[PDB]
Every structure is written in C-alpha cells, then in structure tokens.
Amino acid sequence: LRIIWGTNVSIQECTTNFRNFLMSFKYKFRKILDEREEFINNTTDEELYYIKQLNEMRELGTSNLNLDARNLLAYKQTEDLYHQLLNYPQEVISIMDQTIKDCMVSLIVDNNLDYDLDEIETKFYKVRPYNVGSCKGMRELNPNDIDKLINLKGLVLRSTPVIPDMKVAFFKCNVCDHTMAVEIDRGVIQEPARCERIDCNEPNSMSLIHNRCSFADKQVIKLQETPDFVPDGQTPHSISLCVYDELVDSCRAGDRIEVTGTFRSIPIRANSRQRVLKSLYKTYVDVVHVKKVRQITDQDLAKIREVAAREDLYSLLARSIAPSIYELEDVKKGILLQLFGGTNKTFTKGGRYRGDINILLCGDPSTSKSQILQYVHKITPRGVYTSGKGSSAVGLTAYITRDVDTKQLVLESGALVLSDGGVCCIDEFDKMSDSTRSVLHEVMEQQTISIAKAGIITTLNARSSILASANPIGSRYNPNLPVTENIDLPPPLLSRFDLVYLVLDKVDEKNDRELAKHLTNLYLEDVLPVEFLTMYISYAKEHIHPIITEAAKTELVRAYVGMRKTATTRQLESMIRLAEAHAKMKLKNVVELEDVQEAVRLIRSAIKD
Amino acid sequence: KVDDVTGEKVREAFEQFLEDFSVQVEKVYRAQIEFMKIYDLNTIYIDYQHLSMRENGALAMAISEQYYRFLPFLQKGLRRVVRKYAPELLNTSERVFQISFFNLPTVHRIRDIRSEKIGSLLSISGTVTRTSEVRPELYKASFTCDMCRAIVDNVEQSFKYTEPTFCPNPSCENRAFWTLNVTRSRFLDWQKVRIQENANEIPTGSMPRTLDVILRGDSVERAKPGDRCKFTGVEIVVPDVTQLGLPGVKPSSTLDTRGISKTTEGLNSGVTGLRSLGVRDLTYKISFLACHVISIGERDQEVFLNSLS
Amino acid sequence: LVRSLSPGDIVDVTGIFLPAPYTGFKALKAGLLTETYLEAQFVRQHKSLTSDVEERVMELITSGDVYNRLAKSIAPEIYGNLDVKKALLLLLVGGVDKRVGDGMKIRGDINVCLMGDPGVAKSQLLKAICKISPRGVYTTGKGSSGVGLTAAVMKDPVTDEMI
Ligand SMILES: Nc1ncnc2c1ncn2[C@@H]1O[C@H](COP(=O)(O)OP(=O)(O)OP(=O)(O)O)[C@@H](O)[C@H]1O
Ligand SMILES: Nc1ncnc2c1ncn2[C@@H]1O[C@H](COP(=O)(O)OP(=O)(O)O)[C@@H](O)[C@H]1O
Ligand SMILES: [Mg+2]
Ligand SMILES: [Zn+2]
Ligand SMILES: [Zn+2]
C-alpha cells in the first residue's frame, strides 16, 4: 500500500514476487527465456537451481549470492523488479536482504528439524548482483545516471589501507562518569546537550572516548581506462571505487577487473575552514560485486598414483614439458630432473647442505634456448623470468628504495628472493655486469643475501635454482677452441653450475630437412598432460623426502673412483643430487641402482660435450 | 558517580589470580613481586596460558575482548596486591607500573588488521624498518592557577595538551591561563617504530603494507631495524589532533609541504558536529600500541665463574 | 554540445567571451585583473563496408599492375630505389599471426631495416611511409625518449597523481 517517499518501490509486492521467483524458478524457465536453440533440457529443467544453492548455503552457513539480471528478467511477473532495481538500487537491495532474512526460515522448518536459527538470527545476509546491463567504459558516463547500477571495466592501479568509519559514538560525563551511546546519521554527530541523569544534570560536561566507539572497515581503489578502448592522442582517465565489508582486500594491484556498483556524486569544500562549497561535484562508484578479467581431492590422488605407475614416466614428461622443441631430449631430461631437486637437509653440526640443481645452456646463437626457458617458467609454481642484460646491480636482491606515494622507506625484495623454493630463469647471462655477478656468487654458495643500508642490517633467504642461457662471441661456437674463450664467463662461475649443456648446430641434410619439415607442419593448419605436471611437481616437492641406502654407496664410490682413473669433488655431490632427484620421480621413498645409473649417465653425457 | 559492576568482578578476579596461582605451591607471581622488590623493577609479566586455566577462560576472554576498558581495574587490583604483600614497591626513591602479556595462542599478520578488533589484545609479527628517538611523554600533568596560585595535579592527557578547566577550592573563576609545573609533572619514555610485512606473507606481486607501533616505558630500543620481531599489545585508533584545536599557533591549521591525495579527497569519511571541532571534520587511522616485544628473526675470571652452574 | 571537440583538431568555435571572477587566493595581488573564457555554442570542424568501396577494389583490380604501381606511387618525388618501395609495401601489409596451442606463438609483423650512406634520401622515405597508415609513430634519437617510455609515473598538473 504505502510507498517509500521519493521512489515508487513498495515492499509488499516485491517480497511476494521474490519468494515466488525463488521457489518457482528452475533452469526450465531460464532456457525458455534465452531459447537460443541447442538448449539442453536434460533433467536440468527440474533441478531447482535456486533452492539447491539455498540449502547448500544453509548447511555451509556462508552468505554469498550471485543473483543475475537476465535470470531476474526471466520470470514474467518479476520483470517489474528488473527495471525497478536499475533506478533504485539501495531500496531494492534493502528489500532483498529483508526477504533473505526469512528465506532461511522458509526452508529450515519444512521438515521441522532442530536447527538453532539463533546464529542465523544474529547473522545478516546480502546479495551481489552482476551483469546488470551492457558494459560501458568510464569515458561514457553522464550525470543522467547518478544513483543507478552500472557495470564498469578497468585496470587496478593501487589500493589504500583499511579506513575506519564511525558507527556508534560514545560519550562519557566527566562529573558523574555516565556512559551513553549516540548513533550517527550520514556522518554528522548530534551532540548530547546535557547529561541525561536528572541528578547530575550539568551543562557542558561531555567527553568523547575515541577508542570506545564502534568502527567499520572501508577501502578505496583506483582504476584506469583500458588501453584497448582509448582513441588516438588521448590520456587514460581514472575513477575511484568504494569497497566495504567482506569485499575489502580483494583486488590486487595491476589486475584488470569488471565491477558492478552504484554511481554517485558528492560535493567537496572550497575552503578548508569555511562552510563554503564549490559548484562542481566529484563522481565515484560504490561497488557491490567484483570479478576478474592445493587442496587436491582424493580422485586426484588416485589418478596421480596410477599415472605414477606408468612403465616409463621419464620419457613422457621428457616430451611433455617442451612439445614444440624437437630432439634436444637430453636437455629436457636434465630440466625434468632439475624441477624436482634432490632432498634438502640442515643438520645441526655440519649445517645446511644444498638441494638445488643449476643448469647453464650455451652454444650457437640461433638455437631455441629462450623458448625452453619460457616453457619451464610456466610449469614451476613460483618462479621469475627476467633477463640479465641490465637493470640494477642488486635487481635480483633487496634494494632499499624511497616510496613513491609516501615520503617513506620500503624494503623491496629482488628476483632471487622472490623465487625462493622454486626455479629462477636468467636470460642473456653473458651481458650481466661484473659488479652484480658477485651477488649471484653469494646466492649459489650460501643461499642467503645480506643488505646493510640506511640503518638496516639484515639477511634474506634465496634457496632457489638457477637455469641460465647464454650466447657466445661470434656467429658460431667452434669446437677447436675450448669453452672458456667463447662464453666470456669467469671459470668459477661456469664451474659452480651443476649441469652445463652445449647446443650445437651443424649443417646436416637429414637434420635440416627434419627440422624444416615439422616447422612447416606446425605452420600448416589441419600423450601431453596439461596441468598434471604442476600437481605432480607440488606433490613430489611438498610431501616426498627420499633417503640413501648402501646400494647407492657401492655404485657411487666406485663410479667416482672410476671417473678419477680431472673430476673434482663437486662431481660426486652433483651425482648425489641428481640421483636423489631421480628418486623423487617414479615416486619412491628411497634410492636404488636405477637412479644412480641414470645420474651418472647424465653427468657423463654432459662430460662428452 | 556511576560505577561499573563487571569491572569490579575483573578486578577481584585478577587479585585472586595473582594471589592464588602458585602452580609450578611456589607462588610464582609472588616470587616475581619479591624479585621486583629486591631488584627495583617497574614491570610485571603475566602469561596467557597460566590465566587460560582459571575460570575456564571466563576471565581470560573478558580481559582479551575489552583490554582497553579493563586495564584501569587490573592496575587498581595490582596496587592493592602490592600494598598487601610488598609496600616497598609502592613508592620510588609512586612507580607507574606496567603489565606485560605474552604467549598468546594465535598470531596475526599485518593484513588481518580490521577495525572490529580495536581495543582488543592481540599479537602481531613483522620486520622493523625504522626507529625514532626516545622522547619524553607527559603522563601526569601539574598546573598552577595564575591568580590564586592554587596547584592542580594528576590531570590526565589522552592525545593532546590538556589543561584543567574549573578552578580548585576557592571563589576564583578561571577557564584558562595555567602554567605547567614541568618539575612536578611525571614523564615516560616514548618511541615510534615502523614495521612491514614478512618476505613470505608478501604475495607474488605486492607493495608491502606498513603500520605504526608505539613502544612505551621499559620497552624502548628493544626493536632494532632490519630485525624480525613479534609484538603484542592493544589495537588503538589515533585521531588528527591538529584540527582538534591545539593551543599554539605553530600547527597553523594543517600546514603541508606535499600535496594530499585527490582520490581520497572527500572519500575519507570524517565526522562532524562536535563543538571542539567546530565546522571541521575529524579523521582517524589505525595504529598499534605494544606492551611486550620478542625477536623471532668480559675477560674477567671472577665474574665469569659466577654465571655458570 | 559536450564531447564535440577532441585533442588534435583544427576547428572554428563560436561562443560568448566572458570574464572569469579570479576570486579566492592570489586575487588580491591582481586587484582589477581578471581571467577570461569562452562559453561555446557552435562547432565547425574544418576537415566502412559499402557498395562504393566494394566497387573501388574491383576497379583497382581491373586497372592491373597493382604491385608495381602501388610500389611506385609511394613518394613519387624520389626517383629510384624501386625494390625498397616494393619492400615497404610488404611491410605495410602484415603476415599471419597464428596462435599455436600449448603456448607457442608466431609473429606476422615485418621488421625492415634500411642502411646506407648519408644523403641517399634516407629520411624522406620513412616520413612518407608514416602518411599511408594511420597507426604509426615517427620516433627519433635521444632528443626525446618515447621508444622505451613505458613509465608508470605521470606527474599530471591537474591532479598530481600517477597515471
Ligand atoms: N633518389 C633521390 N631522389 C630524389 N632526391 C634524392 C634522392 N637521393 C637523395 N635525394 C635528396 O636528398 C635529400 C633527402 O635526404 P637527406 O639528405 O635530407 O636526408 P638523409 O638521407 O636521411 O641524410 P642525413 O644523414 O644527412 O640526414 C633531398 O635533398 C633530396 O633531393
Ligand atoms: N629446435 C627448434 N624447434 C622449434 N623451433 C626452433 C628450433 N630452433 C629454432 N627455432 C625457431 O627459431 C626461433 C628461436 O628464437 P629464440 O631461441 O627465442 O632466440 P634466442 O636465440 O635469442 O634464444 C624461434 O622462433 C623458433 O621458432
Ligand atoms: Mg636525414
Ligand atoms: Zn553526568
Ligand atoms: Zn584560581
């Protein structure tokens, strides 16, 4: 009957229409609405999409809804709310929450169970509508749609810390020490005039207790117009976004998001002291829904086990990591062994012993090493792909820098620290400067980086693995001259790399034809897992820790001695790491003869080059 | 004057905890008070786990939720315990006492700081990146009326220089024009430290978040830049005192050298209405106040033989 | 009338020429000096798939000698270097950009470098090619930094925030 002042929305019909919508709607009505042909009605027409989500939310206890606009328009009688929400979002959403308040009761007592409902009474619910209408950029927003729901798209530039907002004031009397709480409306606090206590009753005896009030959380986000839609010779524009309650700390910096929210405009004061305002408002949006652009199940465990039970797991993931790369199977073997890494240990007396494998690729200038590095970048969970051509001498480690937004101090870690526990890929290793090289030296020796600047003395943790690619001086790597002259790298730096591979390119008719054939076949338009590798890698790296047995002793000692029939002691610690990394593959819990045989074969084929 | 009933229950419960715990019968807290008496110390240490077994957490959760309002009663009960068992620790050469809590069950990161824990007892962890000088803070002020020469003492101050209002015992009428007796007033040590998030809690791409932690009393200089420290205390909120009418003309109504953010111009919700503010708008920001700090990241024969067992 | 004007347009704008109040700060020093502005009321800018363009391509096909004529008409002032003009045409068009599965990508864009002794019409040829395609930028030496200026900081005077 009665209508909220100003608008035309009435609660009475809206509540009834919404309950009819929820208990009545199914995928049947949705597929009748869209009816785009080839629409599946296989038992979906009776699934009762809303009621099942309602029940699963009740049993979970979480309050999150994804009501859509097209689905809201689907029902004939509730079509009024579709055009009644775009123009008055706040009141319709207030009705929304009020109806969801008893949507719980409508289903908890259908069978008269023993749910408490008291925690349901205390907790509140809300909705997150999306796909309200056609998406329009910030470059087309008039004052004609203020306080109306819109959908925007843009790049996230920055976020601000949590902002307190007062809800309930708290005043204490300095004479009688009486406490009373005053609600605030739209920001303004209505001051208490005199103490309510009739006996006390003193004028001007009020004191505000700042830390005894009640506060809520706010966040402000900054967006930028996407470069695709901008026209020629223009500068991108910006919009500020208000985020409240559960949605705070959701949008990371640099992401691109599409949001739904209410456009709004407020005045800003001309003079700081005076009451005066200037005749030009500022425009922003209050957001209600945000969209962007571990915990493996038991079935995943079973499929991992059965795949691990394969006869030849080595070759399959040898070919999977680099589908495009043809031949070069040996370097892929080495990279597959590197991605697991030997076990890591730190006993009290001896100290920490390294368990990371370092690989250097070098050779003729027009092979495919860069694509190989960009392949291994994606597979590994946490890693960084940055070239060593330039940048700061401590660009891979901590660099104390002045903050840009605030005139303060921030400690920013580098790329080696940010690749902790993973594989760090370095490109153009030969162009890295003589002064920054020493930094890597402390990374590959002690696995820690120390910074002592601006009154800060501290140490970080590197614990990463280095895969690097380099280029020689000239157009070919002539085998006659030894490695040292061509690669332009210090002998210790080359020596400390666990595996060094030489990629050669010789004019061979068979090889040239075979390469060109599959290259053209790839350009011609006509056994590789997609994400199994990442989960298998995580499982092997986070749960599995092999050990060494005397069977490895017998082979390892005699193999090292036979290699000593100019193999430094580094060689044996390289064989142990490779053998223990192979043991982590073909899932096991202990090393045997096969692992040490594969490791020695790999390290001697490396010697052959 | 209006008094509280829950505060009285907390005050008596704390006295009972101090007097009765004795679990090792050793009277561990009475042993600590005796050690303070003999060594002339000014701070006590209370473990949370020790308190986590009396009243099945009824006292512990009550203290944790509303530490800010219950601290005055805890200190009042401690005063009575000290008077009953060790009067020597009641006067100096009175010692402003401090209570240090530690061993909380769960630890928080800097990105879990929300306004709904303001006033609660928490523990946080972070890496220190800046420390300041040990400045003296005004604790108990003392003034003299210009005309009567009457002396007022123990004028509490919250966040700004507060002088008394209504004059003392005579007929004299006076609203202002006091003279601080800097000699009679009590002072305390004050330090501000800046901390940021740890290297592991930082996401893959992130600009680290920061916080302002206030160390006071005996806790000064215990956190050094570059170290990783675990703080514990109470989460508070600090207003902007410049627009609260500071006495001097030196503030000059928010003199600035850099330009404020236009994005948050009018977006930062400021409350108005109060008479002290006038037509101004008061703003708030979240800071931390710490009571206990821990770190998580002599060739003389006679003195050497003393330390060893 | 809003949004009728965009940066980089030569236009003839009509309106009322009015004095701004110049009040607030720095008004006292001026005293009787005022700003000014123009309230705009009219705009006169000085300067697709349809059957017309469907027939233009057919006409050019019937013309014949498309390759040689297209190469030749490029900068008719300069006489010679006809093979260079053939190659600039291939640069104007673009090769296939095919997105291969599993992450592989192949480029279809053209990279053409023109070396040679000074005073051979080096730097008219280039400028002339910029006219043909609307999407093109002529970047020069260290006088200005635009090739690698993918900066994330912009001290715009209007608001003093980063862009
Ligand atoms: N084939 C040609 N046809 C016509 N004019 C030519 C030709 N070759 C050179 N020119 C002349 O050369 C000039 C255009 O090139 P210009 O010498 O100005 O620049 P550039 O070749 O980039 O050399 P620089 O190194 O001096 O900048 C004009 O004077 C033009 O008449
Ligand atoms: N073995 C190969 N398999 C597939 N493509 C190859 C191979 N060798 C060379 N290529 C081709 O040559 C190019 C190599 O470029 P790249 O290796 O990234 O440069 P860089 O020499 O700087 O590492 C790639 O575009 C790739 O298509
Ligand atoms: Mg020239
Ligand atoms: Zn009162
Ligand atoms: Zn007086």
CATH number at residue B68: 3.30.1640.10
Cβ(A447)–Cβ(A461) below 8 Å: yes
Pocket test for ligand 2, best of A366, A371, A387 (most atoms within 8 A of CB): A371
Expressed as residue numbers, the domain containing A84 is 1-134
Q: Residue A458's closest CA among B198, B194, B290, B292?
A: B198
Domain check: are A156 and A122 in the same one?
Answer: no
Establish how many alpha carbons lie within 13 A of residue A105's alpha carbon, considering only the half-sphere containing its beta carbon: 7
Q: Looking at chain C, which subunits does it touch, using at least 3 CB pairs closer than 8 Å as the criterion?
A: A, B
Q: Which ligand 2 atom is at minimum distance from the Cα of A328?
A: 1
Q: Give C120 Cα–ligand 1 centroid separation in angstroms.
A: 5
Best B132, B228, B263 member to test A by mutation, with max A CBs in 10 Å, is B263
CB contact under 8 A, A210 and B159: yes
Residue where one domain finishes, among candidates B188, B210, B226: B188
Q: Which residue's alpha carbon is at the smallest distance from atom 14 of ligand 1?
A: C121
Yes or no: say if B92 and B32 are a contact pair by the CB < 8 Å rule. no
Is B40 part of a structural domain of the chain? yes
Q: How far apart are CA B253 and CA B243, in angstroms?
A: 7
Q: Are residues A122 and A218 in the same domain?
A: no
Expressed in angstroms, the distance from the first to the final Cα of chain A is: 90
Which SS3 state, helix, strand or coil, does residue A116 take? coil
- SS3 state at C105: strand
For A33, A34, A40, A41, A69, the CA distances from A37, given in Å and listed in that order, are 11, 9, 9, 11, 21
Nearest to B126 by CA among B309, B8, B257, B288: B288
Do B207 and B115 sit in the same domain of this protein?
yes
The reply to whether ligand 2 has any atom less than 6 angstroms from the CB of A539 is no
Distance from CA of B280 to the nearest CA of A (A): 7
Resolution (A): 3.4
Ramachandran bin of C31, using left for φ above 0, alpha for ψ from -120 to 50, beta for the remaining angles: left
Task: Specify whether A39 is located in the same domain as A2.
Answer: yes
Q: Identify whether residues A158 and A285 lie together within a single domain.
A: yes
Q: Is A387 in the pocket of ligand 2 (CB under 6 A)?
A: no
> Quick check: is B169 in a domain?
yes
Residue B117 sits in the same domain as residue B232 = yes
Contact: B265, A409; criterion CB under 8 Å: no
**A280 plus A216 within the same structural domain:** yes
**Within this chain, do residues B112 and B209 fall inside the same structural domain, yes or no?**
yes
Q: Is A364 annotated as a binding residue?
A: yes
Chain breaks in chain C (C to N over 2.5 A) after: 47
Instruction: Count other Cβ atoms within 10 Å, centred on residue A370.
Output: 15
How far is Cα A332 from Cα A372, in angstroms, rounded to an integer? Answer: 9
Of the candidates B205, B253, B268, which has its C-beta nearest A253's C-beta?
B205
Read off the amino acid at residue B196: Q
Both B128 and B179 in one domain: the answer is no
Verify that A44 and A149 share a domain, yes or no: no
Same domain, B119 and B29: no
The residues, any chain, with a CB within 8 Å of residue B241's CB and separated by 6 or more, are B159, B160
Residues A129 and A157 in one domain: no
Residue A341 and residue A451 in contact, taking contact as beta carbons nearer than 8 Å: no
Structure tokens belonging to residue A490: 């210090």
Same domain assignment for residues B51 and B143? no
Mutation pick from A156, A158, A159, A163 vs chain B, by most beta carbons of B within 10 Å, is A163
Q: How far is the CA of C119 from the centre of ligand 1 (A)?
A: 5
**Distance (Å, rounded) from C-alpha A545 to C-alpha A580?**
9
Evaluated on CA atoms B220, B221, B225, B229, the torsion sign reads negative
CB within 8 Å of C19: residues ≥ 6 apart: C34, C35, C36
Q: Which among A322, A393, A140, A166 is positioned nearest to B271, based on CA atoms?
A: A166
The range of the structural domain enclosing residue B204 comes to 107-135+189-240+283-297
Chain B residues whose beta carbon lies within 8 Å of the beta carbon of residue A409: 129-130, 194
B68 shares its domain with B101: yes
Q: Which method, experimentally, gave rise to this model?
A: cryo-EM
- Is residue B272 in some structural domain? no
A145 and A283 belong to one structural domain: yes
Task: Dump strand ranges (E) for B14-164.
Answer: 43-47, 98-102, 121-131, 135-145, 151-156
**Domain identity same for B70 and B111:** no
DSSP-assigned states of every residue in A392-410: -TTTTS-EEEE-SSSSSEE
Mutate to test the pocket of ligand 1, among C83, C122, C140 (most ligand atoms within 8 A of CB): C122
Ligand 1 within 6 A of C127 CB? no
Can you tell me which residue has the tokens 């035309």?
A8
Backbone angles phi, psi at C140, to 5 degrees: -115, -170
Mark whether B210 and B114 lie in a shared domain: yes
Same-domain check for residues B158 and B144: yes
Domain identity same for A130 and A254: no
Does residue B228 lie within any of the structural domains? yes
Which chain A residue has the Cα nearest residue C96?
Answer: A523
Query: Same domain, yes or no, for A153 and A288?
Result: yes
Is A419 part of any known ligand binding site? no
Contact between C40 and C13 (Cβ < 8 Å): yes
Q: Kindly state the tokens that stand for B174.
A: 């006076």
In whole angstroms, what is the distance from residue A362 CA to residue A504 CA? Answer: 9
Q: Are residues B120 and B143 in the same domain?
A: no
Longest dimension (CA), chain B: 71
Q: What's the rounded Cα separation, in Å, for the pair A263 and A138?
A: 11
User: Are A102 and A180 contained in the same domain?
Assistant: no
**Number of domains chain B is built from:** 3
Q: Given phi > 0 = left and psi -120 to 50 = alpha, else beta, which region is B67? A: alpha
Question: Do residues B20 and B115 both lie within one domain?
Answer: no
A363 annotated to bind ligand: yes
Amino acid identity of residue A148, one-letter, is K
Please state, as a whole number, how many other Cβ atoms lie within 10 Å of the Cβ of residue B42.
13
Atom of ligand 1 nearest to the CA of C77: 4
The whole-angstrom separation of Cα A259 and Cα A130 is 8
> Which residue stretches of chain C are H helix?
27-30, 51-63, 66-73, 82-92, 122-132
- Position B176 in a domain: yes
